[PDB]
Amino acid sequence: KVFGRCELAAAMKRHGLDNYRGYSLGNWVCAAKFESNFNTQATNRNTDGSTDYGILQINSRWWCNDGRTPGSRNLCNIPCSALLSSDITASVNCAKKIVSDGNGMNAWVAWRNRCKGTDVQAWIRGCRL
Numbered sequence: 001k002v003f004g005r006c007e008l009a010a011a012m013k014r015h016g017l018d019n020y021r022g023y024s025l026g027n028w029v030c031a032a033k034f035e036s037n038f039n040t041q042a043t044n045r046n047t048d049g050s051t052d053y054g055i056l057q058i059n060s061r062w063w064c065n066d067g068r069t070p071g072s073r074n075l076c077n078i079p080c081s082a083l084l085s086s087d088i089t090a091s092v093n094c095a096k097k098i099v100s101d102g103n104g105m106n107a108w109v110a111w112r113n114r115c116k117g118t119d120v121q122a123w124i125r126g127c128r129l
């Protein structure tokens with residue numbers, strides 16, 4: 001599923017991400033835009049052989065099991081394919097674990113480089129939430 005900007009904002013708000021660990025909703029929308037272009041089916045393979053999955057590009061090195069990342073962890077206790085569904089619940093629940101692990105949203109490279117320090121509220125402007 002390729003979400004619209006405001007559609008994803010409302011889905012994330014419903015799933016409890018607005019101000020989660022102090023990160024306003026626009027941070028989460030900006031991160032999803034630049035990680036996946038709002039596409040739940042996005043996958044990208046990393047140089048270490050791990051793969052990033054879904055709207056928030058969650059890495060199989062630590063967070064999910066894809067059966068082909070030897071020696072990796074599955075800290076969200078989910079198959080990575082669950083992160084590709086049209087229902088963003090699994091991605092949101094895993095992201096809440098990631099952002100709580102001490103490094104905040106710096107775990108998302110695209111957030112650090114393209115959202116952090118910008119006017120992230122622009123990402124939810126005009127949306128009916």
Ligand SMILES: CC(=O)N[C@@H]1[C@@H](O)[C@H](O)[C@@H](CO)O[C@@H]1O
Binds near residue numbers: 056057059063107109
């Ligand atoms: C929280 C998380 O899994 N972030 C991943 C990061 O590990 C990976 O290096 C990057 C690759 O572009 O995508 C995401 O930022």
Ligand SMILES: [Cl-]
Binds near residue numbers: 025026027121122124
């Ligand atoms: Cl915001």
Ligand SMILES: [Cl-]
Binds near residue numbers: 065071
């Ligand atoms: Cl594995």
Ligand SMILES: [Cl-]
Binds near residue numbers: 011087
């Ligand atoms: Cl959803």
Ligand SMILES: [Cl-]
Binds near residue numbers: 021022103104105
């Ligand atoms: Cl933080």
Ligand code: NA
Binds near residue numbers: 062072
């Ligand atoms: Na893994």
